[PDB]
């Protein structure tokens, strides 16, 4: 739809909606977050994309969780993007998901070694 994240284009909306409603009514204290790379950013790609983290887990913890999965080089930085807006580190993934999840009940987060937009 938005032609930005690849997970929306590789799977139909009906399967993504029923996957979100299934994982929500099963694990209520966690949020589904799809993590994907930025357009042609100089950063390794994350083969694992579906991430189920707890709601009260903060964005700061999510930065450490994802950066370990990427095996990122120590020189680069990591910037997340929730609706092309660098999310507040002092916020929780449950509040971001509550305010930014799409119609398929999924929070989409993109990472990049450079701030595309946010600050």
């Amino acid at each position: 739809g938005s032609m930005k994240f690849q997970y929306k284009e590789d799977h139909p909306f009906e399967y993504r909606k029923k996957e979100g409603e299934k994982i929500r009514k099963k694990y209520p204290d966690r949020v589904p977050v799809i993590v994907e790379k930025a357009p042609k950013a100089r950063v390794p790609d994350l083969d694992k994309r579906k991430y189920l983290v707890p709601s009260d887990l903060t964005v700061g913890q999510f930065y450490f969780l994802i950066r370990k999965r990427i095996h990122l080089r120590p020189e680069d930085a990591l910037f997340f993007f929730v609706n092309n807006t660098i999310p507040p580190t002092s916020a929780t993934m449950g509040q971001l998901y509550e305010d930014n999840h799409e119609e398929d009940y999924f929070l989409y987060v993109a990472y990049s070694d450079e701030s595309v937009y946010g600050k």
Binding site: I23, Y27, Y51, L52, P54, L65, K68
Partner: peptide, 15 residues
Amino acid sequence: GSEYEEDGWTVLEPD
């Protein structure tokens, strides 16, 4: 930071 793959997912714990 606990790894956990169930039903095609990555349930990363606070540990």
